[PDB]
């Protein structure tokens, strides 16, 4: 059963959000992926958020750029935790995306990650850490993955040419 | 019949939006005022936008601060022209408000005005200019008001003490 | 009869503003296009704005970059509604364009759209929505166009490879 | 048993973080509060993070301003989910706090909330939503609290004087 | 004969521009002061700039805030050198004023000074230096004034209490 | 006799400053060009500024990027008018260059132009306008050049393909 | 013998730089304090930097705001290590001060500290750490001071009221 | 004996930090180079900083990008002077790197250099200047290197083609 859903405002956002799905493939975490536009499919946004709890989602990762309203509007319609990923926009390099997501008012939170691909991957890792609190097997896989990243850096201390 | 509606995300926004209503009092333009929160009353936002055309509104002026989603979400749900006013936020001085409103994607526009009270007043003036295209009497009142502002500056060229 | 005029500060601005004209071709809205420079042809700017109402324009879309004075100076010379499009500048990525257009003082409004091509397209859509208030046929075409955009997203929910 | 810990870099941060504790008092959520400085008590930071899981914490809310390293360094030392609150700094108004917290690299996430008191309150609400996934009673209290906020706005639509 | 004119967009700008006039009083430089609004008195702006050379002005100092179009539009209408002073705006602290003035395109220059009162004083000093090139007496007064400022700093090297 | 000197911090700045020299070639204005580094040749900077008046310079155009100290330090050492051109830096896109030049304190002015090549060309035009005040022939050439730029825009009003 | 010199651009900078002197009083480090203006006393700046090594200075702490040229120009004239403190400016809140100091080009470094009073204190601490490398007694005093700061935080973990 | 250590958060940082090592090769200064990640190898960071004094390091140059915590966390764990180099990040062009490093609180300083390669080279030059205070031979080599840079600019005053 998919306990996490990855949503984005447009198909072009996949170039960024694919990095969230990559973490789940590595950690073997079942997940749903779907394009839900706050501005082009506002009604679908409402129906998606309203049925999130019933559909079994415990965490929702939402990505959007520019006037990024997707994460916040989903968070306004459900109690399921929402994590937001600011997609890098052309002109403002994601600052508009960042401000539109992180500056939510008291009462409707959205846990925001870094701008771009690093944030997409981290949103998945955070979702995994949340799930891992009640999933011993996943907790172990996260632990092993973290150790693997640390060891790679430790066994290669000199960045200069051989 | 009220052809324009002034909406805002919170009652504290009235300190800013009251300047939009002031322009309408001066120009004798019937208007509706209401608090519609994108995050605290998402369902009311949808019902307000869906019935805007039927309620007779030809222009909607929406004000919000921070992660200002109100103008854009209304614009996504109706063909009635939407004008957005960025309320000045504490930490980011309205830059977050500005970015969240003006950076709308292709297909769902929001005509954005200046940050703060100047923008609120201008949103009302712009709405009035739009209405004035098919209202000769209002067009005349706008003309007289503009002349009055120009004359005040012209009859007082020296800013120094008397 | 052309009820909307698209003006820009330089011919190089056409790479951006062509997206406004594209919306009008799609919606079958007669329009005028012309290069009017606030700094290189200041007198032409004044004559263009002064005769706008008599020439039948109900909405004026003006695009400019850098110290973008074109939209505001036109708005200062006519009661015809003015929509401004900030062209993306090299060094400041359109922030200078945005500030010079959106920050107009009380009394002379300019409805501002997003930086770049998205804003150009949206300025045309907003102008169309304004016209649609008194044009049932255009209102229907806008409605059908919006439905077409929504349906495209709805019939393609999975962004991943086939 | 306290399932959430609220930590901050300095005692002066309490003026902001007290709003996180307020949400927990309202929702009846047991919590721990402590000053842990990344720069003045680096060793305590490591010991706090290392024992977080054993101490029963399922969510950690960390607040800091300026070169805000506290949230990220805790996240680097534990798998327990970390939420970060950017405290508003004097000179940069929290932009430095925001960048130092949200821009974490791939592998070590920190779910970031808004700058200031709104973010502190939201970090607590997000932590509550996370806990609510496996706590039916808390889920109900969150639901009732949200309804109460919505109703207050709905029963007071006119912001003007009586 | 007044060889320099100090103009500003509004009477409220005098709180800033008075510092330009102060330099001229100190240096005994005849000057004209007047409120010329680019947006409220566009026609007066054109007539002022067109007659500047005939009126004997060799330098024009123009101050404005927000969407500061005054300096640039004057520069577009005359060959008399124009110096611009960005007035500090509330929300954007003069960054909008600065961008709207300094970013002029190739062909129409505006020599820009610092944001606020320091810039107003410096615009007058720069105008004085320009005049001083062909005015030996003024050149001497500028020299003596500069020496006086240097000496004050030199005779007070210790900033601590006596 | 060269009445204007064009100086820059490094030879790589020539890619930008060459546009200032281009204006002088077009207008037939004798000029000096030289690399004077505030940081690599501080003593040469002082000797250049000290002898500027004696060498016949009436205007000095100085270009620099990053921590752009060149214009201001020259202005601190001479009464000859100094115009500054902010060169576009890689990381901050000239904002650091702009701030380091335009924000000069009361007493030592630097007339600042736009970031990059547009500013370089404009600094030369401004210098020319300053000289033109006492040079009827140059004033005429500037007039003809401006007319030529205006006419080019006027005879090509339609930006679309033929 | 004073091994460190604290210099600033103006006497008003003392409100900030006094915090650097405070650290030296606490640590018992002999120091010189003087007002040296890059723009008002350029010649004094050169003589101060040229004689720094001969006067026994091993570290120079320089503070300035706005177009902060003082630190960099001193660094260009001496091999004695220079530390820069950005004073908080009114309009740009020290961002101009920060950029003008930190962005020095290859060859002439300035170790930059935080904006404002925190940076002033830290510049003194850094200077002390540099001296401490060859001064066992000072190294011990720095150690004891750091322990004292850590202990204060450790003995007061609960920020709430008693 | 290596008196300086160059550390960085990731191997990809070497493209920037190699310019620090280049200065040391030119000046013949023994140095250590190593990858120490604040987020991926937090324990190694602590052990590296704790043993820095015993390992003979008198200056530590640390480079990092994004949420750049490396320099500050090292500085919190040792009295050895720490110099920080902000690596240029993709989205924010090093502004996040700069803020996370320079804004350190009172008590734990980090001398910060420019964003990118210029800063890396300057951090090495500053470290060299610090060492040169007690190393006459190195002081001479630094002097000769500086003279060489100055002479290159002096013998090539004309940037134009031959």
mmCIF file of N, CA and C in Angstrom, chain E residues 15-67:
data_model
loop_
_atom_site.group_PDB
_atom_site.id
_atom_site.type_symbol
_atom_site.label_atom_id
_atom_site.label_comp_id
_atom_site.label_asym_id
_atom_site.label_seq_id
_atom_site.Cartn_x
_atom_site.Cartn_y
_atom_site.Cartn_z
ATOM 1 N N UNK E 15 11.692 66.363 1.908
ATOM 2 C CA UNK E 15 12.387 65.923 3.124
ATOM 3 C C UNK E 15 13.763 65.352 2.763
ATOM 4 N N UNK E 16 13.876 64.844 1.536
ATOM 5 C CA UNK E 16 15.115 64.278 1.013
ATOM 6 C C UNK E 16 15.894 65.310 0.194
ATOM 7 N N UNK E 17 15.230 65.889 -0.805
ATOM 8 C CA UNK E 17 15.852 66.859 -1.706
ATOM 9 C C UNK E 17 16.327 68.179 -1.074
ATOM 10 N N UNK E 18 15.838 68.505 0.123
ATOM 11 C CA UNK E 18 16.263 69.734 0.796
ATOM 12 C C UNK E 18 17.771 69.699 1.041
ATOM 13 N N UNK E 19 18.327 68.492 1.124
ATOM 14 C CA UNK E 19 19.755 68.332 1.339
ATOM 15 C C UNK E 19 20.585 68.690 0.110
ATOM 16 N N UNK E 20 19.945 68.725 -1.060
ATOM 17 C CA UNK E 20 20.626 69.123 -2.292
ATOM 18 C C UNK E 20 20.691 70.654 -2.276
ATOM 19 N N UNK E 21 19.569 71.278 -1.916
ATOM 20 C CA UNK E 21 19.479 72.732 -1.830
ATOM 21 C C UNK E 21 20.433 73.270 -0.761
ATOM 22 N N UNK E 22 20.631 72.507 0.313
ATOM 23 C CA UNK E 22 21.540 72.917 1.387
ATOM 24 C C UNK E 22 22.977 73.095 0.880
ATOM 25 N N UNK E 23 23.428 72.178 0.027
ATOM 26 C CA UNK E 23 24.773 72.250 -0.545
ATOM 27 C C UNK E 23 24.923 73.541 -1.362
ATOM 28 N N UNK E 24 23.891 73.887 -2.131
ATOM 29 C CA UNK E 24 23.919 75.099 -2.948
ATOM 30 C C UNK E 24 23.922 76.376 -2.114
ATOM 31 N N UNK E 25 23.270 76.351 -0.955
ATOM 32 C CA UNK E 25 23.256 77.523 -0.074
ATOM 33 C C UNK E 25 24.674 77.716 0.467
ATOM 34 N N UNK E 26 25.286 76.611 0.892
ATOM 35 C CA UNK E 26 26.649 76.610 1.430
ATOM 36 C C UNK E 26 27.663 77.093 0.390
ATOM 37 N N UNK E 27 27.506 76.630 -0.846
ATOM 38 C CA UNK E 27 28.414 76.991 -1.933
ATOM 39 C C UNK E 27 28.028 78.250 -2.703
ATOM 40 N N UNK E 28 26.901 78.855 -2.331
ATOM 41 C CA UNK E 28 26.415 80.070 -2.983
ATOM 42 C C UNK E 28 26.193 79.841 -4.483
ATOM 43 N N UNK E 29 25.370 78.847 -4.807
ATOM 44 C CA UNK E 29 25.048 78.503 -6.191
ATOM 45 C C UNK E 29 23.563 78.764 -6.410
ATOM 46 N N UNK E 30 23.226 79.714 -7.302
ATOM 47 C CA UNK E 30 21.828 80.054 -7.602
ATOM 48 C C UNK E 30 21.137 78.813 -8.152
ATOM 49 N N UNK E 31 19.924 78.543 -7.684
ATOM 50 C CA UNK E 31 19.196 77.369 -8.143
ATOM 51 C C UNK E 31 17.681 77.530 -8.123
ATOM 52 N N UNK E 32 17.024 76.746 -8.968
ATOM 53 C CA UNK E 32 15.572 76.731 -9.081
ATOM 54 C C UNK E 32 15.073 75.434 -8.434
ATOM 55 N N UNK E 33 13.919 75.489 -7.775
ATOM 56 C CA UNK E 33 13.333 74.306 -7.136
ATOM 57 C C UNK E 33 11.878 74.224 -7.568
ATOM 58 N N UNK E 34 11.435 73.035 -7.959
ATOM 59 C CA UNK E 34 10.060 72.872 -8.409
ATOM 60 C C UNK E 34 9.564 71.432 -8.382
ATOM 61 N N UNK E 35 8.269 71.272 -8.126
ATOM 62 C CA UNK E 35 7.650 69.953 -8.111
ATOM 63 C C UNK E 35 7.108 69.673 -9.517
ATOM 64 N N UNK E 36 7.654 68.636 -10.148
ATOM 65 C CA UNK E 36 7.253 68.218 -11.489
ATOM 66 C C UNK E 36 7.022 66.715 -11.389
ATOM 67 N N UNK E 37 5.767 66.307 -11.535
ATOM 68 C CA UNK E 37 5.395 64.900 -11.436
ATOM 69 C C UNK E 37 5.267 64.226 -12.797
ATOM 70 N N UNK E 38 5.993 63.129 -12.979
ATOM 71 C CA UNK E 38 5.952 62.401 -14.241
ATOM 72 C C UNK E 38 4.581 61.782 -14.462
ATOM 73 N N UNK E 39 3.938 61.382 -13.372
ATOM 74 C CA UNK E 39 2.643 60.722 -13.449
ATOM 75 C C UNK E 39 1.411 61.583 -13.227
ATOM 76 N N UNK E 40 1.532 62.624 -12.403
ATOM 77 C CA UNK E 40 0.405 63.522 -12.134
ATOM 78 C C UNK E 40 0.436 64.787 -13.012
ATOM 79 N N UNK E 41 1.619 65.180 -13.484
ATOM 80 C CA UNK E 41 1.743 66.344 -14.368
ATOM 81 C C UNK E 41 2.677 66.006 -15.538
ATOM 82 N N UNK E 42 2.325 64.974 -16.336
ATOM 83 C CA UNK E 42 3.143 64.549 -17.483
ATOM 84 C C UNK E 42 3.407 65.639 -18.525
ATOM 85 N N UNK E 43 2.411 66.486 -18.771
ATOM 86 C CA UNK E 43 2.565 67.567 -19.734
ATOM 87 C C UNK E 43 3.532 68.622 -19.223
ATOM 88 N N UNK E 44 3.480 68.907 -17.922
ATOM 89 C CA UNK E 44 4.399 69.877 -17.331
ATOM 90 C C UNK E 44 5.832 69.333 -17.411
ATOM 91 N N UNK E 45 5.982 68.017 -17.260
ATOM 92 C CA UNK E 45 7.305 67.408 -17.351
ATOM 93 C C UNK E 45 7.893 67.701 -18.733
ATOM 94 N N UNK E 46 7.103 67.474 -19.778
ATOM 95 C CA UNK E 46 7.567 67.727 -21.135
ATOM 96 C C UNK E 46 7.915 69.195 -21.379
ATOM 97 N N UNK E 47 7.053 70.112 -20.941
ATOM 98 C CA UNK E 47 7.331 71.537 -21.130
ATOM 99 C C UNK E 47 8.564 71.985 -20.325
ATOM 100 N N UNK E 48 8.735 71.457 -19.112
ATOM 101 C CA UNK E 48 9.902 71.805 -18.292
ATOM 102 C C UNK E 48 11.209 71.376 -18.979
ATOM 103 N N UNK E 49 11.260 70.127 -19.437
ATOM 104 C CA UNK E 49 12.446 69.598 -20.101
ATOM 105 C C UNK E 49 12.752 70.298 -21.428
ATOM 106 N N UNK E 50 11.714 70.557 -22.224
ATOM 107 C CA UNK E 50 11.871 71.226 -23.519
ATOM 108 C C UNK E 50 12.453 72.637 -23.407
ATOM 109 N N UNK E 51 12.097 73.352 -22.345
ATOM 110 C CA UNK E 51 12.579 74.720 -22.158
ATOM 111 C C UNK E 51 13.793 74.870 -21.237
ATOM 112 N N UNK E 52 14.299 73.752 -20.718
ATOM 113 C CA UNK E 52 15.445 73.767 -19.809
ATOM 114 C C UNK E 52 16.675 74.497 -20.352
ATOM 115 N N UNK E 53 17.067 74.197 -21.587
ATOM 116 C CA UNK E 53 18.228 74.847 -22.196
ATOM 117 C C UNK E 53 18.017 76.349 -22.342
ATOM 118 N N UNK E 54 16.835 76.737 -22.821
ATOM 119 C CA UNK E 54 16.484 78.146 -23.013
ATOM 120 C C UNK E 54 16.386 78.899 -21.686
ATOM 121 N N UNK E 55 15.987 78.195 -20.626
ATOM 122 C CA UNK E 55 15.875 78.788 -19.291
ATOM 123 C C UNK E 55 17.236 78.919 -18.605
ATOM 124 N N UNK E 56 18.293 78.482 -19.288
ATOM 125 C CA UNK E 56 19.642 78.589 -18.753
ATOM 126 C C UNK E 56 20.193 77.469 -17.886
ATOM 127 N N UNK E 57 19.446 76.379 -17.733
ATOM 128 C CA UNK E 57 19.909 75.264 -16.910
ATOM 129 C C UNK E 57 20.990 74.463 -17.615
ATOM 130 N N UNK E 58 22.055 74.156 -16.879
ATOM 131 C CA UNK E 58 23.171 73.379 -17.408
ATOM 132 C C UNK E 58 23.203 71.998 -16.765
ATOM 133 N N UNK E 59 22.507 71.863 -15.639
ATOM 134 C CA UNK E 59 22.409 70.593 -14.928
ATOM 135 C C UNK E 59 21.029 70.530 -14.294
ATOM 136 N N UNK E 60 20.417 69.350 -14.342
ATOM 137 C CA UNK E 60 19.114 69.136 -13.734
ATOM 138 C C UNK E 60 19.243 67.979 -12.745
ATOM 139 N N UNK E 61 18.833 68.212 -11.500
ATOM 140 C CA UNK E 61 18.849 67.189 -10.454
ATOM 141 C C UNK E 61 17.387 66.815 -10.224
ATOM 142 N N UNK E 62 17.060 65.545 -10.443
ATOM 143 C CA UNK E 62 15.691 65.068 -10.298
ATOM 144 C C UNK E 62 15.578 63.928 -9.291
ATOM 145 N N UNK E 63 14.664 64.082 -8.337
ATOM 146 C CA UNK E 63 14.467 63.060 -7.322
ATOM 147 C C UNK E 63 13.084 62.431 -7.371
ATOM 148 N N UNK E 64 13.015 61.124 -7.138
ATOM 149 C CA UNK E 64 11.738 60.410 -7.148
ATOM 150 C C UNK E 64 11.869 59.037 -6.489
ATOM 151 N N UNK E 65 10.750 58.516 -5.984
ATOM 152 C CA UNK E 65 10.740 57.217 -5.328
ATOM 153 C C UNK E 65 9.753 56.237 -5.944
ATOM 154 N N UNK E 66 9.917 54.952 -5.624
ATOM 155 C CA UNK E 66 9.042 53.908 -6.153
ATOM 156 C C UNK E 66 9.333 53.674 -7.623
ATOM 157 N N UNK E 67 8.301 53.743 -8.461
ATOM 158 C CA UNK E 67 8.499 53.600 -9.904
ATOM 159 C C UNK E 67 8.929 55.018 -10.297
#
